[PDB]
Amino acid sequence: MFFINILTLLVPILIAMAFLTLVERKILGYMQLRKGPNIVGPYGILQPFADAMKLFMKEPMRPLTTSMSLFIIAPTLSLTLALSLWVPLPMPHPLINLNLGILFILATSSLSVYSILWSGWASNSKYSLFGALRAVAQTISYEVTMAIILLSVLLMNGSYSLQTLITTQEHMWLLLPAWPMAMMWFISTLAETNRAPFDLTEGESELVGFNVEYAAGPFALFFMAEYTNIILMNALTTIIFLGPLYYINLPELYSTNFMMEALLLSSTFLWIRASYPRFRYDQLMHLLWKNFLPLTLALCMWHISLPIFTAGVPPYM
């Protein structure tokens, strides 16, 4: 039964991963006055499966100058961490409820920065290092504010367990309070998934990036990872800040609304991508260290003070 549950979480998520790609190629399309992929299958539903098969069949290329492990470990790590981080998400009931759940999500995300570092060293191709060193920096920087923003949240939740927020948000979303950080969580979620406004990790016009020397299957796994993440981080926004209504008698309306909010915020980063030009490498770090980190550290203190003098210290457990 546990395996059944393991399958129920991973298989559906992976399929959702696939169709996000399709949805990204139609919502971007209609925004740009074009139908998008509808000719393969009905309305393009078979389109994600089609290139998956093309990608795996095409010859994986191992560059003459390439490590053969820091090359194959990197995608495996990227897919493994991203699919793994869905293990504790408390859609209604979580699967593996962890008392220090949010620290698990923060730690697992942090490990993905290596895959970028390992793939870049493995490729030993310019246009790759230039992509990994800047990339690791972006990801790491957007971790420092990412973590502080969560610590502010937790202090108003009382615990690190993601399951507690379902009881914290039984009367109001944590967006109303703490909206200023939501925005800053959303922008940081955009950086950590290397999506558009912050896609310098792999800029195409700039260093076509970390994936240039990777093809076929090796390419797909990260690929899958990114998109699953795209969902996971959006889902964490939909639990931590937008709290779906929870009724203990019927758990699925929690998951039904979790479904609706996650899809809309997942739709939002798709919409952000088409709408904005990409930021400069230093313009990106200028935002986090200058614009956001002082806001976050100060609002972090406000969230240690709001509890005490408003006699609202949250109940542990």
Binding site: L28, Q32, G203, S205, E206, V208, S275, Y276, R280, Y281
Partner: protein, 385 residues
């Protein structure tokens, strides 16, 4: 320092540029652009081809502003023949010349964004661009590479429905500029990527021979369309969009204004196009009409000789410059009395601009260079020739 080709196949270069960089980390210290990847021998081939059979070559030098290019050869050859195009033809060349500057600017503004990372502006305008090519195809038969503007006059009369269709496109086009206007002109992300990047001082721009929006962007007031009015640019009213400071933003804003000013010129041309003939009536210079060559001997002889041998323009040499969308496009045509030219130096607004990349991209990151090439509107056909 490090060296990256940042070269061919990049999605930043047009596909045909080798920009050997000397990146110190991310900052770029020196650029040594290696053009020549699309040198086709355009000017050594023209010497072996008659004046009409060399027109086509001029539609392929800057391949995004075809007709304005072929208005520079047409004006040159016409000068050397002391012949002038008929009144309707001159309006048609000005009508097609501004459709080409809207077409080049949609090319330059949207592809610049494609390089920076904004995807959607390209798709919205490119649909508006095929609407425009249709106008080329409906008047010449080729979507691009028309060959419509002939050394004397233009080749065929406008079909009977084109001016109504150009009104409907021009009527609704400005909202389309307004729409990318909102999506890419105040985005802090665009401004940051474009503002204060590649500033070029006024005297430096004149000294480097920039001569284009690059000249106007830094505040120098020079438009060959008002200063030295070629064709009818003396009977149409427009405002040159001079920018103030020179950052890649002021240059973008100028390019968006010229699209708007060109709609003002296109409006006047549709409102005031004269009834008349589209090609000069000298059979010696412009071919005879299809019915005439099939019923009058003097016309068949003139058709046979013009197509087989040529105009035989009188010996001389001229440098004729017109304001092509990129900048001053000039042809120095040296002519012996023969029907085929002796030399045809195509001055390309672009050979001068690409030279400026090293000076303009000074103290700038790898990413800034992508914007610097984008704001020169460089098409390597014109530079490589």
């Amino acid at each position: 320092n490090m060296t990256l080709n940042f070269g061919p196949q990049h999605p930043a270069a047009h596909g045909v540029l080798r920009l050997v960089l000397e990146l110190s980390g991310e900052m770029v210290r020196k650029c040594d652009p290696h053009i020549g990847l699309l040198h086709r021998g355009t000017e050594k081939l023209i010497e072996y081809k008659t004046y009409l059979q060399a027109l086509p070559y001029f539609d392929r030098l800057d391949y995004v502003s075809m007709m304005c290019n072929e208005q520079a050869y047409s004006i040159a050859v016409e000068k050397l023949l002391n012949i002038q195009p008929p009144p309707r033809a001159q309006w048609i060349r000005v009508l097609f010349g501004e459709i080409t500057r809207i077409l080049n600017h949609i090319m330059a503004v949207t592809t610049h964004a494609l390089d920076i990372g904004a995807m959607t502006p390209f798709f919205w305008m490119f649909e508006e661009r095929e609407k425009m090519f249709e106008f080329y195809e409906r008047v010449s038969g080729a979507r691009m590479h028309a060959a419509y503007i002939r050394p004397g006059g233009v080749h065929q009369d406008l079909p009977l429905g084109l001016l109504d269709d150009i009104y409907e496109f021009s009527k609704n086009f400005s909202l389309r500029i307004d729409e990318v206007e909102e999506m890419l002109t105040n985005n802090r992300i665009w401004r940051n990527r474009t503002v204060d990047i590649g500033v070029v001082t006024a005297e430096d721009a004149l000294n480097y021979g920039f001569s284009g929006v690059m000249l106007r962007g830094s505040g120098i007031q020079w438009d060959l369309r008002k200063t030295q009015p070629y064709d009818v640019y003396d009977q149409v009213e427009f405002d040159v969009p001079i920018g103030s400071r020179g950052d890649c933003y002021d240059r973008y804003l100028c390019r968006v204004e010229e699209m708007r000013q060109s709609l003002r010129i296109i409006e006047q041309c549709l409102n005031k196009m004269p009834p008349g003939e589209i090609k000069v009536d000298d059979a010696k210079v412009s071919p005879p009409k299809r019915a005439e060559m099939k019923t009058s001997m003097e016309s068949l002889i003139h058709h046979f000789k013009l197509y087989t041998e040529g105009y035989q323009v009188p010996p001389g040499a001229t440098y004729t410059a017109i304001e092509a969308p990129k900048g001053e496009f000039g042809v120095y045509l040296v002519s012996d009395g023969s029907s085929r030219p002796y030399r045809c130096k195509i001055k390309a607004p672009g050979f001068a601009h690409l030279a400026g990349l090293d000076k303009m991209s000074k103290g700038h990151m790898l990413a800034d260079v992508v914007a610097i090439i984008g704001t020169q509107d460089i098409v390597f056909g014109e530079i490589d020739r």
